Design an enzyme around this catalytic site. Structure first.
Site, PDB file in Angstrom:
ATOM      1  N   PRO C  66      79.862 -18.186  15.722  1.00  0.00           N
ATOM      2  CA  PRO C  66      79.003 -17.302  15.569  1.00  0.00           C
ATOM      3  C   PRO C  66      77.504 -17.647  16.219  1.00  0.00           C
ATOM      4  O   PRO C  66      76.969 -16.746  16.874  1.00  0.00           O
ATOM      5  CB  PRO C  66      78.900 -16.736  14.242  1.00  0.00           C
ATOM      6  CG  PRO C  66      80.119 -17.490  13.557  1.00  0.00           C
ATOM      7  CD  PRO C  66      80.316 -18.788  14.128  1.00  0.00           C
ATOM      8  N   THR C  95      79.405 -17.549  22.567  1.00  0.00           N
ATOM      9  CA  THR C  95      78.157 -16.836  23.454  1.00  0.00           C
ATOM     10  C   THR C  95      77.110 -17.560  22.822  1.00  0.00           C
ATOM     11  O   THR C  95      76.362 -17.419  21.740  1.00  0.00           O
ATOM     12  CB  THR C  95      78.372 -15.277  23.241  1.00  0.00           C
ATOM     13  OG1 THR C  95      79.204 -14.731  23.835  1.00  0.00           O
ATOM     14  CG2 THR C  95      76.939 -14.798  24.078  1.00  0.00           C
ATOM     15  N   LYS C 170      77.813 -13.235  31.267  1.00  0.00           N
ATOM     16  CA  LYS C 170      78.265 -12.757  29.602  1.00  0.00           C
ATOM     17  C   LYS C 170      76.924 -12.048  29.191  1.00  0.00           C
ATOM     18  O   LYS C 170      76.942 -10.703  29.075  1.00  0.00           O
ATOM     19  CB  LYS C 170      78.566 -13.857  28.803  1.00  0.00           C
ATOM     20  CG  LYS C 170      78.805 -13.161  27.476  1.00  0.00           C
ATOM     21  CD  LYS C 170      79.833 -12.012  27.358  1.00  0.00           C
ATOM     22  CE  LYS C 170      79.808 -11.289  25.967  1.00  0.00           C
ATOM     23  NZ  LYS C 170      80.383 -12.225  24.985  1.00  0.00           N
ATOM     24  N   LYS C 245      71.710 -10.013  19.009  1.00  0.00           N
ATOM     25  CA  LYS C 245      71.685 -11.349  19.327  1.00  0.00           C
ATOM     26  C   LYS C 245      71.944 -11.708  21.018  1.00  0.00           C
ATOM     27  O   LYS C 245      71.279 -12.593  21.416  1.00  0.00           O
ATOM     28  CB  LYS C 245      72.895 -12.026  18.481  1.00  0.00           C
ATOM     29  CG  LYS C 245      73.169 -13.620  18.895  1.00  0.00           C
ATOM     30  CD  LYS C 245      74.551 -13.690  19.785  1.00  0.00           C
ATOM     31  CE  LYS C 245      75.786 -13.184  19.170  1.00  0.00           C
ATOM     32  NZ  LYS C 245      76.864 -12.623  19.939  1.00  0.00           N
TER      33      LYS C 245
END
Lengths: 295, 295, 295, 295
Positions: C66, C95, C170, C245
């Site tokens: 995460p 990510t 992304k 985020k």
């Protein structure tokens, strides 16, 4: 002295018209709310039957109404109010779109009247004290005649430029206020979120290059200035809904000149968010709540 | 007196270190540019071989460097600069992310050193005059020791809070400045586009609820203040690129606390547009050009 | 077959690793939550003692964690995880900031390992179905070796470019999603506020130049798509906190390249407002609530 | 067949009216530019003396004019155009503020006329091909009568709702387009600035959750789609000035309903910046230039 007709006895209109009375003018007054009228009658005004009836003895007509397309429809519609006249000095002191003020200005000229747009800045408190600032568009001539009246209701009197320039100065000023107020609220919240005491951060920024009117006199963080709306749950002061209106007029001026207003436009979007949230009648510094989680 | 090591003789570092000399301190200086060093040597400084060499006799180390991850890499990397020490008072006066300042603060403590973050506000002009404001995070103790040094380089000295609080106050303040500066430029352009004289509008807003630091001392409209960067084609002053940096640090602080900064973030987007346009080294009030077509 | 180590069995990690099992790979798994591990063990995985223990028999290591500075600290810190190796293929599918991915990429090379950044797009639902899109940075060579593994977990496989390019694609993609999602929510609310039926307006825009992914598959207005999060009070889907985020990583990429992101930055400010409001764990289309008063 | 009067032969009006001719209708046409009229006359139209003269034999009047307060002043002013009538079907296909469309709608009813607002979406190219989408407000009855005419000029025909709903759908749709277009341009520039090939990034986002109309059919990055305005220096297409107009109408709708439009409002600010820069007549995807330094 001179016979004044005063149309509009709301939040600002009532104390402004009362100040004229204290200065010794004779006023005929009209407003849509009977109690607003009675307040002025108790202080020595005579009550008029209507807007048209009021101006029917007057040396000067001063209006102060809440809506931009109330004002224009009142003066222009072809059945009074400008149709009823002298010439008499007209002081139109509402805040309305500059385009709309020019439209009224031209109709007033087309008929022989000296008119000023003289929107006002300062509080319900400024109005009551007689310390308002006037921002005035129109002929220097007409400003000279009106001067003793502005001096009775206010303190700083600026000749912003020709017809409509008072509204232009007003909408630029209030749009800038909205930007500095959100800027200030977001800066306060950022500092406090990162471990700072609100009053220490407020003093530093107020006294430095972040300094601004909100920080001098109207801090949005509860408890920073005990006499500010933020310290009494954003009651009173200057309603968010009115700030949103003013920002809306500024957009109209921007469309008219193809001016880019990224900060003002964003300020307006954020004010509209406050409205969705139910805060239309809170003081405009309630924008603080967008940023402060512990409110 | 006391032996000071001064690391960083750039735009701000040189006149700050020169002011310490005029106050009567002994300085060993180091910078990457030889001519910056020679300037200080001509004024009575001794030149050090490097950052490490400099601190190797010092009662106090003052740094003032241009980059956030230059500063941290210098002090922390495990081979000086904090590894070389006393205890000596450290004054770290660069503008760097608060997180990064806390990281340096903790390493300094883990080793026995009194350190302050004391970023600075004011111009190349403030630095030269010795009228800078310091915004100081750290122990009251260490602030007391440093005081006579801050008084030599500056005027307003604020204890913003504990470790890192000077950077927090600094980034909040400069982000707010950026917002009020764009707010001001956009308001000036809107008024002028709608028929107003720039100087009349400037005076009205400066003296009213739109009032702010930019309007008092740094008007973005060419010709309004003849001594402002706007009146000399935005040369000198405080580079747009540096304002964009400062705004970037403010974003980092916002991510760290989950603070919403819609005005500051937008200000940063607009500064980045200025950079694409080639204006990195113009004074930050060059943001005026976004709104003013006749420039 | 090949021995895979899978580190990270969260929302996305668990079904991705389960899909590898269904494809016939042998997995050693590790996660911080025992029940996440037990889920994979029930489906045929072996449990590893830790991240280091897991990779200690593996042909390929796939991580999916995460946090951006969890991932880098895991692989880089000088005591595993990259210190423990072969060469083995590494697929880092979290990510994380592109800068951070390049940093890991270089350390992996400095040591002889084939590594890809292959962040993923699609739902908890995409992960479960094995229909995820991968966006892959790294050597064509390493992409060729990894292909059968991506085909087991996903459907569209894009080679976005060299090292770090998967993260770049992304963060650009997700920032654009946030913009189109707020754009869509604000357009829906504007239409409905002006008298339109939400489903009629949705169909018109979806099929016209306002058309976008949100309108095709993820409408933010409750009741428009009965299977969308909006029709079940924004439960499940893709958390607002995760969108905030992702937007934050996009800002970091923008600072790194001096790119102006006025829409993305504003999107981030609005997401942060949602967080202040308590909506961190609602589906990101909950942004609708900013605009829709009757929710 | 039926006698149609067509008022407005501009960019969209000319090919729309020409398509009616190709469908076999008889048209009397009027426009302010003689050459626009002659173009239609060459294709089989009869030229009318004026707007009033044109409608003076007609079963249906279709207008298509460039300005919002041209249209209303034409139909409403108390000396034609609505004063001259039958009842005849009126199709008002300009893009104008919804408020203004309702005002015209009511005057049309007050007089016995079946009127639709049916603003149009698609290109000069859609208009020429007869593939336009119509977004229609008004009575189902009147939509039924108009249908064969819409089918001659267009392809998708949506009944958006009652009077004014076509304009509402249109302004929501175009505001959303502006947001997705700037979103797309900023995402493309961010990716390319961070090392990606524009065509690889475009394909990834188009096929993923960043997917949108701009990416399908109208990519703002030069060279990505060779037939798009971006690949021919933003000549032709849909003028930035017209997009700025449409966004302006959307603001008016937002003020009318107190809707918050932070993305649309920001889009409008950015379009206005493009105007200051001289790009009013470039295709609206020229917004790319704000973000792309190498243009």
């Amino acid at each position: 002295m001179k016979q004044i007709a005063f149309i509009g006895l709301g939040h600002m209109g009532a104390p402004m018209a009362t100040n004229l009375l204290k200065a010794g003018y004779l006023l005929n007054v009209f407003d849509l709310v009977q109690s607003a009228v009675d307040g002025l009658v108790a202080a020595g005004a005579s009550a008029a039957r209507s807007a048209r009836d009021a101006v029917q003895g007057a040396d000067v007509v001063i209006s102060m109404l809440p809506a931009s397309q109330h004002v224009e429809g009142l003066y222009l519609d072809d059945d009074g109010l400008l149709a009823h006249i002298a010439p008499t000095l007209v002081l139109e002191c509402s805040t309305i779109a500059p385009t709309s003020a020019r439209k009224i200005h031209a109709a007033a000229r087309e008929r022989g009247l000296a008119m000023l747009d003289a929107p006002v800045s300062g509080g319900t408190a400024g109005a009551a004290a007689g310390t308002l600032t006037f921002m005035v568009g129109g002929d220097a001539e007409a400003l000279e005649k009106a001067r003793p009246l502005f001096e009775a209701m206010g303190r700083n009197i600026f000749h912003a430029g020709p017809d409509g320039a008072g509204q232009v100065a007003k909408v630029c000023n209030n749009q800038l206020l909205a930007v500095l107020m959100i800027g200030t609220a977001e800066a306060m919240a950022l500092g406090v979120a990162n471990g700072l005491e609100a009053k220490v951060l407020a003093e530093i920024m107020r006294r430095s290059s972040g300094g601004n009117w909100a920080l001098e006199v109207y801090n949005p963080w509860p408890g920073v200035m005990e006499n500010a709306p933020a310290s009494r749950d954003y009651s009173g002061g200057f309603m968010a809904q009115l700030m949103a209106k003013d920002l809306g007029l500024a957009q109209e001026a921007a469309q008219a000149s193809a001016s880019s207003t990224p900060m003002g436009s964003l300020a307006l979007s954020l004010y509209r968010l406050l409205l969705k949230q139910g805060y239309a009648e809170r003081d405009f510094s309630v924008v603080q709540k967008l940023f402060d989680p512990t409110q």
